[PDB]
Amino acid sequence: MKQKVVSIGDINVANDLPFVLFGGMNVLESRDLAMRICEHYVTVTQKLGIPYVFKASFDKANRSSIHSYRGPGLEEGMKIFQELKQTFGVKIITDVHEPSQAQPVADVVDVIQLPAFLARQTDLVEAMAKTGAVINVKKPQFVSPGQMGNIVDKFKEGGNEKVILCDRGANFGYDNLVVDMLGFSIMKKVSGNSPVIFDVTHALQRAQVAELARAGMAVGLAGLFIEAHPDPEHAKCDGPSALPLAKLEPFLKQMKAIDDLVKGFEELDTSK
Amino acid sequence: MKQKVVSIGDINVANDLPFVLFGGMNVLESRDLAMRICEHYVTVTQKLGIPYVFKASFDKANRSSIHSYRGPGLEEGMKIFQELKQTFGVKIITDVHEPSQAQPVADVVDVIQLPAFLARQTDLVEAMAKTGAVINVKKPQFVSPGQMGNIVDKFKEGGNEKVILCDRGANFGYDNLVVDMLGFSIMKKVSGNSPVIFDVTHALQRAQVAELARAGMAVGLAGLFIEAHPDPEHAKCDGPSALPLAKLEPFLKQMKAIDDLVKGFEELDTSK
Amino acid sequence: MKQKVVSIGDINVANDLPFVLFGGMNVLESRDLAMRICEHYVTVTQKLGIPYVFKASFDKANRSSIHSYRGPGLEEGMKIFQELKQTFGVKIITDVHEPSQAQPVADVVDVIQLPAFLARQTDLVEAMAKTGAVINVKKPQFVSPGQMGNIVDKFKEGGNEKVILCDRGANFGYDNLVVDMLGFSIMKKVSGNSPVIFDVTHALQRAQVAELARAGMAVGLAGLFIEAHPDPEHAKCDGPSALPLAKLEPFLKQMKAIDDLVKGFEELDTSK
Amino acid sequence: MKQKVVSIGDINVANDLPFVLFGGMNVLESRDLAMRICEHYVTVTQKLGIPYVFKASFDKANRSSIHSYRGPGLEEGMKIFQELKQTFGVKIITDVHEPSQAQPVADVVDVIQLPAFLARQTDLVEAMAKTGAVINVKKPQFVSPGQMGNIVDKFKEGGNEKVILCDRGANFGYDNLVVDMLGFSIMKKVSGNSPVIFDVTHALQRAQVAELARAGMAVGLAGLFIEAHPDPEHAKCDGPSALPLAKLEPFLKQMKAIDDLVKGFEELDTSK
């Protein structure tokens, strides 16, 4: 049993290879800000030796009001990424919500994404199936890990066969998430050992971001999917929970001494 | 504290009024079948004295494969309802999945609906907001009842102020649903005592359909939302779980001796 | 398939027979109080026509401090019941925590009981097995209903074969209970259709006591197990949640129009 | 904020110190076997440089039948440990179920223990309070981590102030456990930073023993609490889930490269 590869460009994403960080930012507030954000990761990434992918959203179809900030917009959002790629030389992972946005973003970026809440939207997956560009299937809170196969199959059946599975904890009572650490493994199986990643800042909806991201790494994953803001305290709105920018590096050393020190272990078996 | 009314035509839906059945069928297989289905309810309804609304889907955006039956289609689906209304004189409740389908169905039917998985899709709610036609907000399995206000507010903010809340149990471990009977009440509150209904066949994903629908009724609801098939055993596919048609009537007597015998109780208070 | 009977004296407890209330009080504060409590039930019981059993604890092995009120004590507690039986002519259901208390209480009362937390204490069940006096197995929050057989078997194997199963909801996240209404049925099965009862005030750990106890009754049970205090608001300590004494009667009319109106239904089957 | 120490003899148990393994075996089948078990740990422990404590039960008050193996017995069980201590020079951690067994075991062993199911048994804790010998509070599946203070307080109030908290996952639906990795931290707090340990073989009720024990270590704990059997496959009965003896060492290297490589990290803060 070997691991699978859904490599994006010069990058190879696989459970036995070193972890690839799909960090970044939540919503695209403004290039002035964005870029500054895309700036630290890159520096810390290259400086620490960790594959990178920048993430940012150009739209928030979901919120608690219409009289709020949708986002940069699909048309005005794609552009914004452009200016970024060239400037820094990193890929762009963003999420789609309409069968239209499908192809566009396919040209503008590298790693597209499927929102959890839509993981079971035939029409939209049969459309993302076209692009043939790497896909990220965020795992819905209300869905058992062993159900990740059907979603992966359907992607195959549509033409695309390069998919990734991101974990964001699972419902635990009302208004609460807990990350079954045994999930990741069960998820490897049903998808054909496809790439598995942990969306930590999202499994938290805190000082916990560290300790909680540490555990997931010591199990062996194809990487993380994080978010950080320069001033978390104030921008402190809702949805996920971002990281304290400055603390990016010292935090990322925590992972390597894991993502490396564990991605090079002599396969064990507490089975037989 | 009085109850609210989101009456559809000659029908009044409210927590203190008798229960209104939003029964029907899942997907629209064929008028030959549909109608036969729409036939028994109507007979049993009128014969037993229970308000009625027929439900049927014209599309299943969600499934486990593209190489399967989407459904009658929006354009070819709406028509099918037409032929029904006149023939029997009952309203039509169906669900939408696209901001387009919004207005169309608004003319063709009476009770439109919001799928759970989309309960938090701004754009699509701001669109359903237009129609101004009664709305049904299926409560997502992964969402606490006290969160039903924001969804109800947003509907107001968009213009529509006639909304209903349907309950379908809440996640309990992996691959399992349990219906918090205390939900219904908590749901009345946050929405401004809006109409609350139980989607039983869906809270089950069995001989349990009865016993489980009984409990919900003895708490006092603005009604149920059921489904039945003439040959459940064979058509035994997945998604919800339908009822055994024939058993419609004797089953519905179970509710009345509740929906009535409890909808006429001297308000109690185990509070003070 | 017929129901089983674990009748205590002139009382017959069974799922198809009318519900038997095992109400009463939590801890035995004082006869002056106790009795007053035992007074209203009895009056309302006889006045409404509902079998009765009074419940009260003579010890609270579990609490949040040693420097607190253990309880009347086993030796000084048993006596207290005596004075009650004669005065009112109702049985006494109390819980045990030691293999010693086993036999004593067996002579002093009618319905002994097994605490949930101990449902799996061999030695203590093999001891309660002796008494041969009716037993009540409170169902632990952390145990699936289908596991209630083993506990019932062991009771048989020990000699006793008259056991009852009380339901108190099941863990739902941290610090929260939800009552799977489908539990009761699943519990009937594995125990050999033994008697099933709902411990409502305990499934709540409120104005909810009513609405929540209504649901359970409309499913058909061998009765309830409640608690009420004359001044809930103040005595408002913790553990279960008692009922507002005065409100006993008007509340109990709610049940009959259910426990009766449903205990006389023409067996249905949404199965075939 | 410094960590606390509840050191047993020449051993110091604390969250910031290296992890201490409280491994061993479940029930005491026989010295012939026991010892052989106590043999590998010791060898691997000393050989790998990891503090050790051997665990084994001398009684199983809980089971699924009386006509089964209780265990060596308290009187005949204590003795068995004796012969072990001298032979190998390691401490003995065993669990108690009666206020009597309290003091005895206090002389015979080093680390006594509180069973989860009894974590809230006043009388028995007020008794374990006497011994003044280190205590292990297994955290009940049905109890939130933030509730671990009251249990720790009561232990203080009784005289003993050297307590440890062992985590064994928390209920997740029916018949299932999931380990909230964020638990450990929350548990440190409420107990006064007391010692926290993970009971992995018990959080599993498999090949998962490894991956799952890895996560817990990368969060930083005062150690583990494991169990292994020479022939797991056959002795494959129930209760916890043991480890494959032989695989003890290569498995324990997994922990050190964590328990060490993380117990020597520059305190981070994703907080501010």
Ligand SMILES: O=C(O)C(CF)OP(=O)(O)O
């Ligand atoms: O919103 C979320 O919480 C997650 C994951 F947790 O992703 P998505 O935006 O695709 O639903």
Ligand SMILES: O=C(O)C(CF)OP(=O)(O)O
């Ligand atoms: O699919 C379901 O289970 C429910 C409710 F349970 O409704 P919807 O089709 O809107 O998600």
Ligand SMILES: O=C(O)C(CF)OP(=O)(O)O
């Ligand atoms: O304490 C409880 O909550 C219940 C039931 F919920 O009974 P017991 O005292 O036997 O554990």
Ligand SMILES: O=C(O)C(CF)OP(=O)(O)O
């Ligand atoms: O039995 C168990 O599962 C655990 C812990 F999971 O310990 P205890 O024997 O004290 O209840």
